[PDB]
Design a protein around this ligand. Sequence first.
Ligand SMILES: O=C(O)[C@H]1O[C@@H](N2CCN(C3=Nc4ccccc4Sc4ccccc43)CC2)[C@H](O)[C@@H](O)[C@@H]1O
Ligand SMILES: Cc1cc2nc3c(=O)[nH]c(=O)nc-3n(C[C@H](O)[C@H](O)[C@H](O)COP(=O)(O)O)c2cc1C
Ligand SMILES: Cc1cc2nc3c(=O)[nH]c(=O)nc-3n(C[C@H](O)[C@H](O)[C@H](O)COP(=O)(O)O)c2cc1C
Ligand SMILES: O=C(O)[C@H]1O[C@@H](O)[C@H](O)[C@@H](O)[C@@H]1O
Lengths: 659, 639
Amino acid sequence: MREVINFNTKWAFTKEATEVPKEMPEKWYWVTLPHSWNEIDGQDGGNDYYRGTCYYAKQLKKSELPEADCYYLELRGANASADVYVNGKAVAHHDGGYSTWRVDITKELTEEENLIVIAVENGVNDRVYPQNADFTFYGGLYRDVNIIAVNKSHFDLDYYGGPGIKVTPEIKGADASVEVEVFLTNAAADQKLVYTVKDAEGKEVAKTETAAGETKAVLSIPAVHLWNGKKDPYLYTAEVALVGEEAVDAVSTRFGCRTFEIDPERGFILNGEEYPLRGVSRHQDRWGIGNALLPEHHREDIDLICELGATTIRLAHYQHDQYFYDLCDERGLVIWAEIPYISSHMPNGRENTISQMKELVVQNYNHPSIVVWGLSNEITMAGSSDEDLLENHRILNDMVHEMDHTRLTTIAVVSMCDIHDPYIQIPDVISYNHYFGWYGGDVSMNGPWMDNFHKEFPNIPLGMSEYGCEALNWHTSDPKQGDYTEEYQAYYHEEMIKQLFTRKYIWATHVWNMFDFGADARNEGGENGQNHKGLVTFDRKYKKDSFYAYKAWLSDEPFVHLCGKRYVDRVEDTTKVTVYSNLPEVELFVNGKSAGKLQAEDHFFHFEVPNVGESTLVAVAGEYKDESHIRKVDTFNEEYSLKGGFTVIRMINLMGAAG
Amino acid sequence: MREVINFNTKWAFTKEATEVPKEMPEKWYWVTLPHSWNEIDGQDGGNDYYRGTCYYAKQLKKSELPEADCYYLELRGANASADVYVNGKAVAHHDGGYSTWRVDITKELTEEENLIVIAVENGVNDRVYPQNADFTFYGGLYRDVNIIAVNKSHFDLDYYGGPGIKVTPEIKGADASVEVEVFLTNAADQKLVYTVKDAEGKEVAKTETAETKAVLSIPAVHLWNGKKDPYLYTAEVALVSGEEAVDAVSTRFGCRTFEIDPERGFILNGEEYPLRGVSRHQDRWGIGNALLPEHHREDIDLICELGATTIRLAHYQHDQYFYDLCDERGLVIWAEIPYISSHMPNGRENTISQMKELVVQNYNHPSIVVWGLSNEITMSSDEDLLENHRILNDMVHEMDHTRLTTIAVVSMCDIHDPYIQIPDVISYNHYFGWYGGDVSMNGPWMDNFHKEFPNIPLGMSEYGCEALNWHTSDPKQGDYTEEYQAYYHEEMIKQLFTRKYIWATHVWNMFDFGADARNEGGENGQNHKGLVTFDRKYKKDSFYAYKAWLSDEPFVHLCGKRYVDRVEDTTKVTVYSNLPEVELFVNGKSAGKLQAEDHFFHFEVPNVGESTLVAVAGEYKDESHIRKVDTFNEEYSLK
Ligand SMILES: O=C(O)[C@H]1O[C@@H](N2CCN(C3=Nc4ccccc4Sc4ccccc43)CC2)[C@H](O)[C@@H](O)[C@@H]1O
Ligand SMILES: Cc1cc2nc3c(=O)[nH]c(=O)nc-3n(C[C@H](O)[C@H](O)[C@H](O)COP(=O)(O)O)c2cc1C
Ligand SMILES: Cc1cc2nc3c(=O)[nH]c(=O)nc-3n(C[C@H](O)[C@H](O)[C@H](O)COP(=O)(O)O)c2cc1C
Ligand SMILES: O=C(O)[C@H]1O[C@@H](O)[C@H](O)[C@@H](O)[C@@H]1O
């Protein structure tokens, strides 16, 4: 007899208030959640996006409410910190705007029209992470806000926004012994607890029944369909109801049965067999709506990834939407979750890291797609690992292991960090963020580098948590580093794939980023307030040529992509044309005539054709084909040009990305 | 070298200010135009949507500006009254938020950091229409705001938001003598090079004066013949100084003739062309009236699919883009002003301004043929109301001789009212079949009027029925069910579409719209009389009743797909289709064939268990599901 009520519409908002209003405002701005006040100023550049305290005000009419014993206000996203006032009385406080938190307000609903006021703030302080990072801290209620109506004896809702249900299976041969642990609040020894494990087809495959004191119960599943990533993302269902002789409450959750390990030589191991983890990472925002994403947005993001064919996603730099974690469990994607413990180590940040990390594990413990909790991201950029930074990581690592005996801890190390740093020895596995080819250096430096680490620390699994190159609608026939051309980004990734995908000991690679994201301090390229290191544009409307270099290596969709379709005007008399394909052979036709056939085991077909007038190029591979257009010109079209040993200007735009 | 610059991004907004800010606000709410502050409170009901004065703030960087001689700030839609400040100084005011207006601000860009403040107001007063109507008065800058850079010597930018170019084609049998009038400002020893092109851009005429008139002839006229052929010539004129040009206005136009016969109905280019269509408001669910081009495209696409020949763009001037879309798709359009419901004696001044704006700005659209003056203004007549309407009629007739004037009468209005005799044609708003009476009443009523006033072309400007997610087997006026809305519209077509003397019909409404004062049907703040839902996501069954009569697109639709649980042992199945014969299959077995001239195929079927129905009209099919139950599923009823 549990009920969740949406509470997203009719929310008065303002950034001008300097106090909680005693009466419901009348001349405030009307917003419906998800919402953020940085959806515009947090994507245009300048590092100017307003950061302060803003207020949401809405009225919870006691009448338009189902009759229950306890009423909880559920918030799933309040970046960064929030206070919840009811009838002008402070009722709750939370820090870190990426985790679910709730509050009991039954005793505070005295009047008929109770005024709920929520003050949100995304300002600066030494207490709450993130404070120094390369992504806009969109402020506001950018996720759902609910009201939960349950009985006085309900599954705990007051523990770090947890689900009140813990499911940890154990695979013994071809069977599984699933331990389901539920948590209660104000229970009675009388009422029973009925555990139920249902099939993916809603078929009851087992069941138990204990007492209010027996919050643990080991069910058994014979002939378990194991969760096997994309091969077979099977999912079971666990339901536990608190029964007098009728259900007074009931939590539920899906889970998956699988075993994994991260061999330092064989890479990722999924359910016994080798399962190379090669994928991307994504930020939780979209152009125009900040992070006020809708379920469709989560669905479109993960759909482009499944098309590209990634086997893993790095959901940095914080906790992501529950619906997206559920989508990964559905599609069988192996997932990396972490916390905003990024960049500089704030000694006063301890209290927050434990809380957020606690929230990340309690809330996402049942997702079979998660396998690693990240403790930090480039946390040594400020200085080096003094005692505090080291003790801070030890606490989180020990804490994570204490609550989860099924997953491994990891960290993402900044490029400059020496491999002998003390804190690289705390987590179970580690990964590096290397931009050889886009920051100082050459793309060829990545392969040897990863090798050098593997030599000094062969039993510490090494991975690539980050690597990428910027690319906009600039083009050139002479690709270089710093021209921001789509062409160069294709090369950079071409060689990156050849080096990383052929090294089995790199447990996971994660392109940075799948999509361009918002970072209001970035003044790079022609478009400011944006990081253009993605394979797909911020509006998710254009797939860059690099998108298809990865599809050729990870996708079963037979295809043929002619690169550089936006580079029509070309001055050279013999121009280079690149075709991507997961097919053995490709033939390119310039103006109907055949320019020759090409084989490329690396899937990177590099042709050369004559640049004569307006030509219509066509690339065939079996029954699959693609077409592009070129045109000979006298001089280079300036519409294509955007005009560590970086140039002065480039380095300034990069230095500005701090503040 | 005229340059138009978009200026809709980064706009500081607030509803709390009571004075023009001296500096750029730092804590206001960011918005990008199109925008309106009544996007939520104006579609939720309770008539509570905030109406007052709100402020927009945005800086104009002098450096970041293609610089010539003059800079005009152009507003394409500020509902309703607005004031424009530049650096704290007042520069222009406007009343009526549905027409374009501009203001030269060149002399006011003294600093490099020019602060623009536009105060928009949608309050209550006795001077500006609309004030009483069944649609929300969305406030704010819900249309584009541009910066026009022109030479000192430019085409008129200061005459009621007009284009400075007037195209009046005259058809001399099989040739055309298209008059082209241009209007200048701070001009001069300067020439005018007129040019007329066709659809492919091939010059069909040219001349050169020094002399703002010019009659150009295009032989072998390709007439704008509605949907059959909406041909469109484009006219260009450039102000020449020696060998270069300093400004150039253009406009697409169409050559055509038409007549509204009190007997033969509407006549286009010589032969009858029955105008049977709908009307559309300029709002969508969730965004108020801050419409994007895509939203205009999607609106016209949905009506084209329906196959209507005319739309009543009520109750005000619409966006220039939607008018342009009508010109391309060959639709005949009825435009009008927000002179609706109640006659404000002090509102006459606004009706003249708004009416002047509607004609000057939309004179070149070949899609428009009638200019509306009022809508249900008699909710009896008085000399003031009569003198106001006479004033507009004469003004409209003196400004544009090529079109006819009209009005929309409330159904209660006595036919012998003196006001019905002022305009050229008239139309009545009749809701026989929703607001009382029987739907069968419309036929006789239209007959009666045409008997007394046979010389006055009579049409139906409005008619409709409300329908939501409610369903029944016993459709009755007042259930708000999709079934009765289909029954109503079925009988209305049989009555209206068969009477040629009705010069035009306008289904009310094509889409659901925002009417914050409404509180009925189960979804408040809306009128659900549309054929398509407010979000334009669901075409109601009644949508397909019209598609059967107006669209040549072969199709077959099964009515009642969302009324699955039924109690009867024998159920009625309705199928619309513009095809001659339709066979209905219940769980594979054929229940018979049916032919229907009126495109309304009414079958009878046994309701036994979970039955799957299939409608076949040759190669086109439609699918539906039903199942027999014991009691009426009360989730269908507006209990
Ligand atoms: O750079 C990215 O685009 C992404 O990759 C990672 N960065 C994080 C920050 N740092 C940056 N590098 C360099 C490189 C060379 C010289 C100086 C710097 S200083 C700097 C200043 C502002 C912004 C970024 C940097 C390392 C790589 C982050 O993990 C991820 O958050 C970010 O989005
Ligand atoms: C995945 C997981 C979920 C848990 N959920 C709850 C819960 O919802 N309610 C609860 O009272 N305890 C829950 N616990 C138990 C706590 O981890 C622990 O027993 C204790 O409540 C925490 O103490 P502390 O956080 O104050 O140090 C959960 C434990 C785990 C591992
Ligand atoms: C459709 C149309 C557009 C017109 N546009 C202009 C114009 O842009 N500039 C102008 O000076 N006159 C224009 N005129 C002419 C005026 O209507 C008319 O000749 C006279 O200037 C009216 O002056 P008034 O504003 O004092 O009534 C236009 C006329 C019509 C019919
Ligand atoms: O009454 C109705 O439903 C409609 O009919 C007309 O009288 C009104 O002009 C229109 O605004 C209403 O929406």
